[PDB]
Amino acid sequence: SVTSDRTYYGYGDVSVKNEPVNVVVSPFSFPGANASLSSGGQGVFKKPD
């Protein structure tokens, strides 16, 4: 007696939470400790991490 509207459903959800990367900074204080940078000087400074 009923004319069914033939439509059933399925569903799902997608969760995009974080950003791809975290650029953790540990800044450099390049004259350093137990060192010295003078005017006109020339050299190299290294920070591994």
Do 30 and 37 touch, CB atoms closer than 8 A? yes
Residue 13 partner contact from Ca ion, its own copies, none using kind-dependent CB cut-offs of 5 to 8 Å? none
CB of 24 to its own copies, least distance (A): 5
CB of 32 to its own copies, least distance (A): 16
DSSP label at residue 39: T
Residues from 1 through 49 that contact its own copies (CB under 8 A):
1-6, 17-19, 22-26
Q: CA-CA distance, 27 to 47, in Å (whole number)? A: 9
Q: CA-CA distance, 49 to 27, in Å (whole number)? A: 9
Binding site for its own copies (CB under 8 A): 1-6, 17-19, 22-26
